[PDB]
């Protein structure tokens, strides 16, 4: 269809203050009653639009009385000749069963739920379906007592009630104005895990934690993760949960990950429930971190929410930096820093050069659902954790408090947070405001300069934002630059500038500019964008021996993981330029030499050796060319790989018997350890064979949890290992009625390094635990392979571009959502080689003719085929 724009934002013509749901449910035909009370704020003349998608009209009252001035168009019910003040009385019907969308009331297993973000509540009744107009619920709930014994909506359960014919009914009241977006209905048969938590300041909330019966064994982790949530959201920002009750359910049928829907929050069952030998490591700390992130919500997001959804990074870059502090308090700071760098380095710089590229504040918007994005979230956070960088801490929650003392029970904008964070600390950010208009990813380059005679280090910094698909113009930004100097010892050298201290982190804010540090008293080796101060690319020409020497001396072990990317990324670029032309890896001595150095360091971490040796991943190290070569960056991660396991060999296997362990527990040190044994079995497995084989099988065997059952199973598909098909069929053969662990071996199978992986992939849609309607099993299968197998994705053929165009020939009617989310390996079409463009842009053009194409795809298509 056509796009919206963020600079057409005006406020609307009618509010609506309080709504009274009634639902009469059944899967196939829900009849829904809605009395609002509105008002007009516009002109007279000015209809009432309210958003509708799919509903079927039966009656408008307006103060009582059959409306007989409204009409039906695309998409809206148009109501003219309206009082100034007034009750609106809406029965639609509506068809669960038939929603396979998942936006709006969807039926998931035996259980009907809700998801509205972003616009999804107008597929449950007409509304004024934007996140500026809020109003208090109140919701009642009719249905089978039989099939849907729990009902469930926001606040607080307020009148409850059994009817003839084995019906029953619950009425639920949540006094706190909110958007439609976070309405939230579920019916339904569960198992519900109930605990208690208090709040610092004595307020005894309830928890409930819905799951379908039978997996009340995987629902502790979630609610011992909520209450640490609870627990240190109230610890680090002052903040109280507000209700009295806590609910959470989880669906296997879910298109996000998760809804902070206010006092009822619907969960992918993929972040809740785990078990020692169903989760790894990852599972754990992904359900910390999503059920943390929901509960951050409550204020980031409910107390104050978005006036428009140009404004989604107020509460989802806000909400990240808060689930990245939450899981950086509890576990290692450090690996949190670097897997969230890997992450943008990876995966969103990668986007922020795509025909999608939009600042985290867009200002074009077709279908909003496809700016739930890596750009929004993760380098929204970014743009977040630079201002709590400039600021400090103190600052940071000064501002925090002075945005809710502002905002709470208001919708604002990301310039209203700015503001709060502004006039709090007295930091200017009014250049700083830059990052939420501008796309792109900045390239810094640094220049320096040693000067004895005077003791004097020069710093020449300048920066520049290349053009983006999306805008042609680009202006330097406020860059929060961080450094330190390391002296000959490793000692750091204060940064001074005439007998004064200088602050550490700079501020970059010109194209280009100039920095002069006295006192330098040793030639110093820099740690450039200390902590990745900003989402920026970094130009320096490192030697090789000032990267190893950090990787030896940095005091923050962030940086030293980060001198060993640079010094890898050197390595990487050579030997794929040595790939195509059909020679073999070549790797100095000393780069093994400081690998070897970090294994045998008895002054590590575990956790730090751990992500040192865990190679960059195939999406990272496309990051580093201009043209990628899948194959080419796969065929040479796979042989750096064989060479660190053949050079570390009698090392690798030391550590990997040291950090044995016989215990099981999901505590950081312990998964430091285990972290650090399975990237010592990883490469073990891609050295000498036999040895391998053995290792890798006798893991998966005799392992006690998932994570370490999986590290060895996803090893010996990785080095193509004897066992594999074996240990692969053992899986199935006790997971298959499991779908959350088989989505493991799903990607297992879409990521093999295999020749036959494409024809495995679509036999695997027969598969028992696969299907087409479960977004989770479709990720987890098609979107690895797309997404996560670059180099079978990419085949010379073309074979992989038909897969997914017939996948996404399906899933365009089936679930747009999750074609736009398949469709992203397609669009970065103008990254690749000619020949393997023309395909692309052929697949492309086959999508964009389909009958009935999708917005969501609509709008990715028409701009990566521009
Ligand atoms: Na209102
Ligand atoms: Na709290
Ligand atoms: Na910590
Ligand atoms: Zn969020």
């Given at each position: 269809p056509?796009?919206?724009?963020?600079?057409?934002?005006?406020?609307?013509?009618?509010?609506?203050t309080?709504?009274?749901?009634?639902?009469?449910?059944?899967?196939?035909?829900?009849?829904?009653?809605?009395?609002?009370?509105?008002?007009?704020?516009?002109?007279?003349?000015?209809?009432?639009?309210?958003?509708?998608?799919?509903?079927?009209?039966?009656?408008?009252?307006?103060?009582?009385?059959?409306?007989?001035?409204?009409?039906?168009?695309?998409?809206?019910?148009?109501?003219?000749?309206?009082?100034?003040?007034?009750?609106?009385?809406?029965?639609?019907?509506?068809?669960?069963?038939?929603?396979?969308?998942?936006?709006?009331?969807?039926?998931?297993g035996?259980?009907?739920?809700?998801?509205?973000?972003?616009?999804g509540?107008?597929?449950?009744?007409?509304?004024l379906?934007?996140?500026?107009?809020?109003?208090?619920?109140?919701?009642?709930?009719?249905?089978?007592?039989?099939?849907?014994?729990?009902?469930?909506?926001?606040?607080?359960?307020?009148?409850?009630?059994?009817?003839?014919?084995?019906?029953?009914?619950?009425?639920?009241?949540?006094?706190?104005?909110?958007?439609?977006?976070?309405?939230?209905?579920?019916?339904?048969?569960?198992?519900v895990?109930?605990?208690?938590?208090?709040?610092?300041?004595?307020?005894?909330?309830?928890?409930?934690?819905?799951?379908?019966?039978?997996?009340?064994?995987?629902?502790?982790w979630?609610?011992?993760?909520?209450?640490?949530?609870?627990?240190?959201?109230?610890?680090?920002?002052?903040?109280?949960?507000?209700?009295?009750?806590?609910?959470?359910?989880?669906?296997d049928?879910?298109?996000?990950g998760?809804?902070?829907?206010?006092?009822?929050?619907?969960?992918?069952?993929?972040?809740?429930?785990?078990?020692?030998?169903?989760?790894?490591?990852?599972?754990?700390?992904?359900?910390?971190?999503?059920?943390?992130?929901?509960?951050?919500?409550?204020?980031?997001?409910?107390?104050?929410?978005?006036?428009?959804?140009?404004?989604?990074?107020?509460?989802?870059?806000?909400?990240?930096?808060?689930?990245?502090?939450?899981?950086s308090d509890?576990?290692?700071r450090?690996?949190?820093?670097?897997?969230?760098?890997?992450?943008?380095?990876?995966?969103?710089?990668?986007?922020d050069?795509?025909?999608?590229?939009?600042?985290?504040?867009?200002?074009?918007?077709?279908?909003?659902?496809?700016?739930?994005?890596?750009?929004?979230?993760?380098?929204?956070?970014?743009?977040?954790?630079?201002?709590?960088?400039?600021?400090?801490?103190?600052?940071?929650?000064?501002?925090?408090?002075?945005?809710?003392?502002?905002?709470?029970?208001?919708?604002?904008?990301?310039?209203?947070?700015?503001?709060?964070?502004?006039?709090?600390?007295?930091?200017?950010?009014?250049?700083?405001?830059?990052?939420?208009?501008?796309?792109?990813?900045?390239?810094?380059?640094?220049?320096?300069?040693?000067?004895?005679?005077?003791?004097?280090?020069?710093?020449?910094?300048?920066?520049?934002?290349?053009?983006?698909?999306?805008?042609?113009?680009?202006?330097?930004?406020?860059?929060?630059?961080?450094?330190?100097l390391?002296?000959?010892?490793?000692?750091?050298?204060?940064?001074?500038?005439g007998?004064?201290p200088?602050?550490?982190?700079?501020?970059?804010?010109?194209?280009?500019?100039?920095?002069?540090?006295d006192?330098?008293?040793?030639?110093?080796?820099?740690?450039?964008?200390?902590?990745?101060?900003?989402?920026?690319?970094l130009?320096?020409?490192?030697?090789?021996?000032?990267?190893?020497?950090?990787?030896?001396?940095?005091?923050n072990?962030?940086?030293?993981?980060?001198?060993?990317?640079?010094l890898?990324?050197?390595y990487?670029?050579?030997?794929?330029?040595?790939?195509?032309?059909?020679?073999?890896?070549?790797?100095?001595?000393?780069?093994a030499?400081?690998?070897?150095?970090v294994?045998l360091?008895?002054?590590?971490?575990?956790?730090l050796?751990?992500?040192?040796?865990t190679?960059?991943?195939?999406?990272?190290?496309?990051?580093?060319?201009?043209?990628?070569?899948?194959?080419?960056?796969?065929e040479?991660?796979?042989?750096?790989?064989?060479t660190?396991?053949?050079?570390?060999?009698?090392?690798?296997?030391?550590?990997?018997?040291?950090?044995?362990?016989?215990?099981?527990?999901?505590?950081?040190?312990?998964?430091?350890?285990?972290?650090?044994?399975?990237?010592?079995?990883?490469?073990?497995?891609?050295?000498?064979?036999?040895?391998?084989?053995?290792?890798?099988?006798?893991?998966?065997?005799?392992?006690?949890?998932?994570?370490?059952?999986?590290?060895?199973?996803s090893?010996?598909?990785?080095?193509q290992?004897?066992?594999?098909?074996?240990?692969?069929?053992?899986?199935d053969?006790?997971?298959?009625?499991?779908?959350?662990?088989?989505?493991?071996?799903?990607?297992?199978?879409?990521?093999?390094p295999?020749?036959?992986?494409?024809?495995?992939?679509?036999?695997?849609?027969?598969?028992?635990?696969?299907?087409?309607?479960?977004?989770?099993?479709?990720?987890?299968?098609?979107?690895?392979?797309?997404?996560?197998?670059?180099?079978?994705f990419?085949?010379?053929?073309?074979?992989?571009?038909?897969?997914?165009?017939?996948?996404?020939?399906?899933?365009?009617?089936?679930?747009?959502q999750?074609?736009?989310?398949?469709?992203?390996?397609?669009?970065?079409?103008?990254?690749?080689?000619?020949?393997?463009?023309?395909?692309?842009?052929?697949?492309?053009?086959?999508?964009?003719?389909?009958?009935?194409?999708?917005?969501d795809?609509?709008?990715?298509?028409?701009?990566?085929?521009?």
């Amino acid at each position: 269809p056509q796009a919206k724009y963020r600079h057409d934002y005006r406020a609307p013509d009618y509010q609506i203050t309080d709504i009274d749901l009634t639902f009469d449910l059944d899967a196939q035909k829900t009849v829904v009653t809605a009395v609002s009370q509105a008002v007009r704020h516009g002109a007279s003349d000015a209809p009432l639009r309210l958003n509708g998608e799919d509903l079927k009209l039966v009656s408008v009252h307006i103060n009582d009385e059959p409306w007989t001035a409204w009409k039906e168009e695309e998409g809206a019910l148009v109501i003219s000749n309206l009082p100034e003040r007034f009750t609106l009385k809406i029965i639609n019907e509506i068809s669960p069963a038939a929603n396979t969308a998942l936006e709006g009331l969807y039926q998931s297993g035996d259980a009907l739920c809700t998801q509205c973000e972003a616009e999804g509540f107008r597929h449950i009744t007409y509304y004024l379906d934007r996140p500026d107009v809020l109003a208090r619920f109140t919701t009642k709930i009719i249905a089978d007592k039989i099939k849907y014994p729990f009902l469930l909506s926001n606040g607080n359960r307020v009148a409850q009630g059994e009817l003839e014919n084995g019906r029953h009914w619950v009425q639920w009241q949540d006094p706190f104005p909110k958007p439609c977006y976070l309405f939230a209905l579920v019916a339904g048969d569960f198992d519900v895990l109930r605990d208690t938590f208090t709040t610092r300041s004595g307020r005894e909330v309830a928890l409930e934690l819905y799951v379908d019966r039978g997996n009340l064994d995987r629902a502790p982790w979630a609610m011992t993760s909520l209450k640490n949530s609870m627990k240190w959201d109230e610890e680090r920002f002052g903040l109280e949960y507000d209700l009295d009750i806590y609910m959470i359910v989880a669906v296997d049928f879910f298109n996000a990950g998760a809804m902070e829907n206010k006092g009822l929050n619907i969960f992918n069952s993929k972040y809740v429930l785990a078990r020692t030998d169903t989760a790894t490591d990852k599972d754990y700390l992904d359900i910390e971190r999503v059920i943390g992130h929901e509960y951050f919500h409550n204020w980031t997001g409910n107390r104050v929410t978005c006036r428009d959804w140009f404004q989604l990074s107020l509460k989802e870059g806000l909400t990240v930096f808060r689930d990245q502090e939450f899981s950086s308090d509890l576990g290692s700071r450090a690996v949190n820093r670097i897997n969230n760098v890997r992450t943008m380095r990876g995966l969103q710089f990668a986007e922020d050069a795509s025909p999608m590229a939009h600042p985290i504040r867009p200002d074009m918007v077709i279908e909003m659902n496809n700016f739930y994005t890596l750009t929004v979230y993760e380098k929204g956070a970014e743009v977040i954790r630079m201002i709590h960088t400039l600021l400090g801490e103190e600052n940071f929650q000064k501002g925090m408090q002075l945005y809710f003392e502002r905002h709470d029970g208001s919708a604002a904008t990301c310039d209203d947070f700015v503001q709060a964070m502004e006039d709090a600390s007295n930091v200017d950010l009014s250049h700083f405001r830059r990052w939420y208009s501008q796309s792109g990813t900045p390239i810094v380059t640094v220049k320096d300069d040693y000067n004895p005679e005077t003791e004097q280090y020069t710093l020449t910094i300048s920066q520049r934002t290349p053009a983006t698909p999306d805008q042609a113009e680009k202006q330097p930004l406020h860059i929060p630059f961080a450094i330190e100097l390391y002296d000959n010892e490793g000692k750091v050298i204060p940064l001074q500038k005439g007998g004064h201290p200088v602050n550490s982190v700079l501020n970059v804010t010109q194209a280009e500019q100039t920095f002069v540090f006295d006192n330098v008293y040793f030639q110093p080796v820099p740690a450039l964008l200390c902590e990745f101060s900003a989402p920026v690319k970094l130009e320096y020409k490192w030697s090789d021996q000032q990267l190893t020497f950090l990787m030896r001396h940095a005091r923050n072990d962030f940086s030293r993981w980060d001198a060993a990317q640079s010094l890898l990324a050197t390595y990487i670029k050579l030997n794929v330029a040595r790939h195509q032309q059909g020679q073999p890896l070549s790797l100095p001595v000393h780069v093994a030499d400081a690998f070897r150095a970090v294994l045998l360091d008895e002054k590590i971490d575990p956790a730090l050796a751990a992500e040192i040796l865990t190679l960059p991943s195939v999406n990272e190290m496309a990051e580093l060319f201009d043209i990628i070569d899948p194959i080419a960056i796969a065929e040479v991660r796979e042989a750096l790989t064989r060479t660190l396991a053949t050079e570390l060999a009698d090392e690798l296997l030391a550590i990997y018997n040291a950090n044995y362990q016989s215990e099981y527990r999901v505590e950081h040190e312990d998964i430091a350890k285990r972290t650090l044994r399975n990237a010592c079995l990883r490469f073990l497995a891609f050295g000498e064979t036999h040895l391998a084989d053995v290792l890798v099988s006798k893991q998966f065997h005799e392992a006690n949890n998932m994570t370490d059952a999986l590290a060895a199973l996803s090893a010996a598909v990785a080095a193509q290992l004897p066992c594999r098909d074996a240990l692969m069929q053992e899986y199935d053969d006790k997971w298959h009625q499991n779908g959350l662990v088989m989505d493991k071996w799903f990607i297992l199978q879409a990521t093999s390094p295999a020749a036959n992986v494409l024809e495995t992939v679509r036999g695997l849609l027969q598969h028992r635990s696969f299907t087409m309607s479960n977004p989770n099993r479709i990720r987890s299968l098609i979107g690895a392979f797309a997404g996560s197998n670059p180099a079978a994705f990419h085949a010379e053929d073309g074979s992989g571009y038909l897969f997914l165009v017939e996948m996404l020939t399906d899933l365009n009617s089936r679930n747009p959502q999750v074609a736009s989310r398949l469709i992203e390996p397609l669009i970065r079409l103008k990254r690749y080689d000619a020949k393997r463009q023309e395909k692309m842009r052929a697949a492309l053009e086959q999508l964009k003719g389909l009958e009935n194409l999708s917005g969501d795809l609509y709008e990715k298509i028409t701009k990566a085929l521009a």
